[PDB]
Amino acid sequence: ADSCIQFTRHASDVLLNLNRLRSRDILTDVVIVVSREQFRAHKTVLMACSGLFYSIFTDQLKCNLSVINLDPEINPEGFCILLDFMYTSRLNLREGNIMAVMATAMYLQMEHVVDTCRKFIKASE
Amino acid sequence: ADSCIQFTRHASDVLLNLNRLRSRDILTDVVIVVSREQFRAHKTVLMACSGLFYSIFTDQLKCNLSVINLDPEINPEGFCILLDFMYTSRLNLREGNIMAVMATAMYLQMEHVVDTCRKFIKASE
Amino acid sequence: AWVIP
Amino acid sequence: AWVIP
Numbered sequence: 384a385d386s387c388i389q390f391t392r393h394a395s396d397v398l399l400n401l402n403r404l405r406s407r408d409i410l411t412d413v414v415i416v417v418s419r420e421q422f423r424a425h426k427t428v429l430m431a432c433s434g435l436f437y438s439i440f441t442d443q444l445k446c447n448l449s450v451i452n453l454d455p456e457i458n459p460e461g462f463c464i465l466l467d468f469m470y471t472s473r474l475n476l477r478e479g480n481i482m483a484v485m486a487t488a489m490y491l492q493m494e495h496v497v498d499t500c501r502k503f504i505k506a507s508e
Numbered sequence: 509a510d511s512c513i514q515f516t517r518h519a520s521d522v523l524l525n526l527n528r529l530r531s532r533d534i535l536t537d538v539v540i541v542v543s544r545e546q547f548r549a550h551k552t553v554l555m556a557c558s559g560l561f562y563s564i565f566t567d568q569l570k571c572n573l574s575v576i577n578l579d580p581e582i583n584p585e586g587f588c589i590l591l592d593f594m595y596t597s598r599l600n601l602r603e604g605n606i607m608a609v610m611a612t613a614m615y616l617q618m619e620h621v622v623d624t625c626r627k628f629i630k631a632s633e
Numbered sequence: 634a635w636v637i638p
Numbered sequence: 639a640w641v642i643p
């Protein structure tokens with residue numbers, strides 16, 4: 384109906400609670416492996432944030448995998464920063480990590496992050 | 509780090525994408541039964557919105573159930589309205605459904621919805 | 634919170 | 639959108 388009321392903070396409260404489940408390792412259903420590092424997460428959150436994970440977990444065979452190995456060129460810290468952004472809306476972008484974060488966001492198909500990385504790089508040129 | 513940037517629309521975009529997965533029945537992992545009606549959903553979203561589902565899916569036996577039957581006194585339309593609110597932040601509150609929505613929100617332990625229902629009832633008294 | 638969206 | 643939170 385077009386007569387709905389809306390609770391402004393609802394989406395952020397949901398995301399905060401999903402990150403609390405991740406912290407507590409509650410109902411995490413996939414491990415993403417990035418070189419030597421492992422990250423536990425929820426497939427639905429990954430799919431909701433990343434075009435690559437959306438394609439992976441909608442595939443009729445890969446949807447059932449409990450481990451996904453990323454390309455060995457992907458930087459684990461870059462992935463960690465992007466996984467935290469998925470679950471919090473906050474991106475820890477720094478001079479020392481921007482190239483790794485941008486390359487990881489391009490691979491993960493997260494256009495908005497790629498955009499802000501390009502802007503920060505262009506500003507320093 | 510305290511040096512993060514934030515993407516304002518991220519939490520709402522995640523919620524919209526989770527609702528699109530629900531619409532498409534992608535990676536739904538539980539059916540909630542309310543009298544004769546069945547509702548497919550994602551356990552993590554239910555837990556992130558409801559104190560009752562948080563308690564249910566953190567229980568060491570119930571976390572593994574694929575079907576949860578609610579109390580037969582719960583109104584299916586009331587539940588449907590609250591499930592849509594979980595996935596969209598929008599509550600279709602109407603004169604004809606407010607008592608059922610409030611009773612369902614009390615059972616589901618969704619305090620903010622109980623609050624707005626009490627306020628709308630008090631305004632009509 | 635609640636608003637008219 | 640991006641902001642300083």
Ligand SMILES: Cn1c(=O)ccc2cc(Nc3ccnc(Cl)c3C#N)ccc21
Nearest residue numbers: 430431432433434492493494525528529
């Ligand atoms: C390209 N791209 C970005 O640049 C950023 C985020 C992003 C998120 C998704 N995810 C979905 C898209 C559409 N419909 C659904 Cl249901 C999902 C989910 N889950 C896909 C592509 C994305």
Ligand SMILES: Cn1c(=O)ccc2cc(Nc3ccnc(Cl)c3C#N)ccc21
Nearest residue numbers: 400403404555556557558559617618619
């Ligand atoms: C009482 N109550 C409301 O009145 C509304 C919403 C609501 C949502 C939750 N859910 C969580 C709470 C804390 N920590 C976590 Cl990880 C989750 C999850 N998932 C619990 C109680 C609630």
Ligand SMILES: [Cl-]
Nearest residue numbers: 493494495496
């Ligand atoms: Cl993005």
Ligand SMILES: [Cl-]
Nearest residue numbers: 618619620621
């Ligand atoms: Cl609530």
